[PDB]
């Protein structure tokens, strides 16, 4: 600590908030498609931040005048029904973006400024990149007094704040400091935000933020300075896919057997995005010598790296019985040191991006690659175990590969889909939930239907025009996650609902809930068809649901989706199911005067 005048708080710097008093802990957003803020009441304090709270990180910004854009947005959101054309609206559209773009310039024109009490704040979230505000309405659903927590992209509607301390230590227009128990308050709502004392139907460690007259004095806490960012280096908030060059990865899966496995997927090439997500994501964190979980390691880190799907670290038995899966790591045996490897060191002090080698904690042990497997796997064709031993070498380097933050924010989006859709789908086919969640699961899917296309919609259901834009990395993200399985599971649950045919009891009676979600379901499943064959490998599962289609629903194009692209080898398994005799027999079982579908199967 050789500070002269620093450590205050500055615009362009990331931080985290902490509740105090009646409720204690951080503020997060459980869920990524969701909108509910959360205050964990028990797991966090000043000296022991718990495991998953990378998601608590908040970035600070300048203001961003909401107005022009608000007008455009308001015109776009209908009810007027008229007084709109390209001469007005589309001439306002490019009159919106460039003056939206100058907000991004002014963002990059304030790298550091001493923040005084009273000015704008414009808080912003790291992982979501979707910042919070309130409205001047009263949609406060638990405690009925005048607030709302909306995480928004455009967001410049009352997202301006004004900040004051709790105590009369400083004054209006003085430099803030880390540890200031500040108040925080929207400039037009008037009511400062507050830590509620309520729970709801989620995990039992749930709470949320309300906004009332009384106060919750929030101490910010800092672990990152500014002017050091993405910037071809590593910080204590990054993610990484450590790939080798013998075989350019290493694996990490949870095995039901106690040891776990580093098999090599029969190849590793180019160190590309062609990789399973769950095996690869480690985060990089520093120690900072502090109880607060720190950042911005700059040589001599004694770093440690944490898994993303589950929470575990490195460990090693040096000679005896590495990818040892230890949850909690305040010991010595989870913290490593790293090699110079031509970045020569006396006082180098700069964390470059290219290549590293490894050495463990305190013994300074050489982590290498050996030639043996575990041989519990009973003849996998190729597999190698990762062993360590203090013999020094120059051979077993592997690269710090920076992952773009756009790809990690698509990963959890797919993860949060299965953590929501994979649970609700089994129950509304079993019983009854709120009908507003049927509205809520709709735009859940409707946000998904142009997520996978990669482009924001202009119409409502115009999914055929964006069909000409493929990107394999998103469908591989959707393949490796279980979203597809869950959606097909959901289809079967409504089939069981009709059972407890499909057109009659479910489609012909209600017409609102079930036809619309299948149209939400079919075009998603159609979207995975046109890129690569491993999606078509799943058609060896999704052939029985098209075998049981009968509502005349939208699902018939999936048959064209299975067949439009000529499949000769896919059809070698697909028509190689041999149930075309059932399928065209089902077409023959379709004994109504609608014969065209049968003709189409024959045509395929």
């Amino acid at each position: 600590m050789s500070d002269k005048m620093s450590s205050f708080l500055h615009i362009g710097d990331i931080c985290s908030l902490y509740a105090e008093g009646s409720t204690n802990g951080f503020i997060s957003t459980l869920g990524l498609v969701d909108d509910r803020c959360v205050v964990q009441p028990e797991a966090g304090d000043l000296n022991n931040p718990p495991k998953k709270f990378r998601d608590c990180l908040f970035k600070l910004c300048p203001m961003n005048r909401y107005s022009a854009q608000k007008q455009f947005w308001k015109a776009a959101k209908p009810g007027a029904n008229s007084t709109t054309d390209a001469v007005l609206l589309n001439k306002l559209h490019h009159a919106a973006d460039l003056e939206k773009k100058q907000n991004e310039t002014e963002n990059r024109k304030l790298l550091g400024t001493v923040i005084q009490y009273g000015n704008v704040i414009q808080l912003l979230h790291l992982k979501s990149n979707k910042y919070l505000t309130v409205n001047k309405r009263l949609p406060a659903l638990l405690e009925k007094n005048a607030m709302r927590v909306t995480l928004d992209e455009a967001g410049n509607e009352g997202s301006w704040f004004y900040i004051q301390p709790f105590y009369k230590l400083r004054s209006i227009g003085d430099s803030v400091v880390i540890g200031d128990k500040v108040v925080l308050n929207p400039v037009n709502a008037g009511q400062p935000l507050h830590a509620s004392s309520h729970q709801l139907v989620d995990n039992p460690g749930c709470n949320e933020v309300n906004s009332v007259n009384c106060n919750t004095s929030w101490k910010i806490v800092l672990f990152m300075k500014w002017s050091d960012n993405k910037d071809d280096i590593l910080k204590g908030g990054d993610v990484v896919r450590l790939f080798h060059a013998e075989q350019e990865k290493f694996l990490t899966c949870d095995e039901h057997r106690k040891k776990q496995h580093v098999f090599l997927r029969t190849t590793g090439r180019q160190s590309a995005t062609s990789a399973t997500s769950s095996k690869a994501l480690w985060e990089v964190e520093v120690v900072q010598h502090d109880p607060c979980r720190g950042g911005a390691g700059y040589w001599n880190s004694l770093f440690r790296f944490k898994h993303l799907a589950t929470g575990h670290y490195l460990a090693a038995e040096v000679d005896p019985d590495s990818l040892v899966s230890v949850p909690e790591g305040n010991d010595i045996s989870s913290i490593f040191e790293l090699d110079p490897t031509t970045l020569r060191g006396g006082d180098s002090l700069v964390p470059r991006n290219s290549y590293v080698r490894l050495r463990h904690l305190c013994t300074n042990t050489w982590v290498h690659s050996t030639n043996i497997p575990i041989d519990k796997e009973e003849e996998k064709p190729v597999m190698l175990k990762i062993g360590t031993s203090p013999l020094k070498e120059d051979k077993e380097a592997f690269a710090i590969v920076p992952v773009s933050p756009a790809e990690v924010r698509d990963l959890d989006f797919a993860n949060d889909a299965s953590k929501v859709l994979g649970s609700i789908a089994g129950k509304l086919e079993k019983g009854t939930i709120t009908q507003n969640e049927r509205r809520s699961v709709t735009k859940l899917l409707e946000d998904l239907v142009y997520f996978v296309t990669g482009g924001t919609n202009s119409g409502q259901d115009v999914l055929e025009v964006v069909f000409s834009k493929p990107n394999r990395e998103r469908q591989k993200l959707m393949r490796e996650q279980n979203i597809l399985k869950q959606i097909f599971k959901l289809l079967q649950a409504p089939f069981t609902d009709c059972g407890d045919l499909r057109l009659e009891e479910l489609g012909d009676q209600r017409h609102a809930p079930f036809r619309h979600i299948c149209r939400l379901c079919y075009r998603v499943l159609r979207h995975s068809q046109q890129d690569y064959r491993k999606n078509q490998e799943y058609i060896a599962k999704q052939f029985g649901f098209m075998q049981k289609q009968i509502g005349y629903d939208v699902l018939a194009e999936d048959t064209i989706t299975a067949l439009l692209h000529n499949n000769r080898k896919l059809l070698e398994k697909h028509i190689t199911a041999a149930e075309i005799d059932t399928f065209v027999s089902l077409v023959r079982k379709n004994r109504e005067p609608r014969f065209l579908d049968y003709l189409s199967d024959l045509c395929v």
Binding site: L302, I335, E337, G346, D347, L361, C362, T363
Partner: protein, 38 residues
């Protein structure tokens, strides 16, 4: 005159920083040794 003085002076000044860094490095190393310690 200014160029030569700048050069010699500059070199010496730059050269010194180096001692200091080794000692500083050691302190943190001692902290790691302390954790390594059983």
């Amino acid at each position: 005159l200014e160029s030569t003085m700048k050069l010699v002076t500059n070199l010496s000044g730059q050269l010194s920083e180096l001692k200091d860094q080794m000692t500083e490095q050691r302190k943190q190393k001692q902290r790691i040794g302390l954790l390594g310690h059983p």
